[PDB]
Amino acid sequence: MKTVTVKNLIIGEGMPKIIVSLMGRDINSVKAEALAYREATFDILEWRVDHFMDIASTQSVLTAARVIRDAMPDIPLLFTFRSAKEGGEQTITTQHYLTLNRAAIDSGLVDMIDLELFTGDADVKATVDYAHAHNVYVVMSNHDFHQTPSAEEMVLRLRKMQALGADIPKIAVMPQSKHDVLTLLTATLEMQQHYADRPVITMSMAKEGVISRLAGEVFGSAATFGAVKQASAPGQIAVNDLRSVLMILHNA
C-alpha cells in the first residue's frame, strides 16, 4: 500500500478520512462557505468547482481559490470539477477541463485534483504526469448515477486508474437494490484482498448505500464524504454523525 500523505494526514491507513465539499456559485459564496466550514471537523476539503458559475474566467477561479486558502491555509484541499455526465452541475469541453485542472495545479493552492477516468486515457495520463511533476496528487474517479456495475467491472476500472498513475482511485455507484450495496462492498474488499497497492475510495450512493459510507475501515474505503449543511451527493449524512460512527468502528 502506497499511502498518500498531505501535511500530517495519511490517506490509506487507520480510520477513513472525512471529506466535505464547497459548492458555492461565486467568489463571495465560496468565501462564506469556507469561513463556515472551518468551524466543522473533517480531514479534507473538496472544492466542487462545477457549481461555480463563472467557470470560463481564469481570474475568477483563481480569486476563489485564494479566498478558500485565506480561510483555511493549511487544510488538505482537493480541486474537483465534476462533469454533468458523472453527476455534476455543468459541462465544459475536454480542453477547458484539462486547462482548468492544469491551472489549479500551477496555482500551488491545491494539494490534490480529481480527474475523471472516462475523460480519456491519454489526456488523463498526461494530466496525472503534470500533477506529479508539480507535487499534486490525483484522485482519479468514476461515477454511475444510474446503476451498479458488476464487482468485476468495478475492480477492473479501479485497477485501470492505478495503471494510469492515480494516487487514489475512486468510484461512486447508484444501487437499485440492497444487493447492489453488497456488490459495491464486495468490490471494495476485492481491492483490499488482491489489489492493495493504492488507497481506494468507494461508495454506494443514496439511503440504501449509506452503510458503505460508514464501513470503510472494515472493507477498505480510505475516505468518506459528509455534509456540513447540504449534501454534495445523495446518501451523505451529517458530518458529525459520520465522525461518530467512524470513531465507534475504529475503537470497537
Residue given cell 478520512 in the structure block: 17
For 82-116, letters b (16+ CB in 10 Å) and e give bbeebbbbeebeeeebbebbbebbebebbbbbbbb
Query: Distance between CA atoms of 228 and 22, rounded to whole angstroms?
Result: 9
Query: Distance between CA atoms of 152 and 186, rounded to whole angstroms?
Result: 10
Among 2, 96, 207, 229, binds a second copy (CB under 8 A): 207
User: Is 141 among the residues that bind ligand FSQ (CB under 6 A)?
Assistant: yes
Lay out the site mask for ligand FSQ across 90-109 (x = CB under 6 A, - = otherwise): --------------------
Q: Is 143 a catalytic residue?
A: yes
| In the complex, least distance from residue 238 CB atom to a second copy, rounded to whole angstroms | 9
Which residue, 131 or 237, is less far from a second copy as judged by CB?
A: 237
Residue 143's binding partner out of ligand FSQ, a second copy, none, with CB under 5 to 8 Å set by partner kind: ligand FSQ
Strands 201-204 and 112-116: unpaired
> Nearest residue to ligand FSQ, using CB?
233
Which position among 85, 132, 143, 178 bears the catalytic label?
Answer: 143
Considering only the stretches 36-44, 65-73, 116-124, 231-239, report the one whose residues sit in contact with ligand FSQ under the rule CB under 6 A. 231-239
Write out the three cell numbers for 171: 468510484
Q: Is 160 a catalytic residue?
A: no
Query: Distance between CA atoms of 226 and 56, rounded to whole angstroms?
Result: 29
| In the complex, least distance from residue 204 CB atom to ligand FSQ, rounded to whole angstroms | 9
Kindly state the number of chain residues that form the binding site for ligand FSQ, as judged by CB under 6 A. Answer: 15
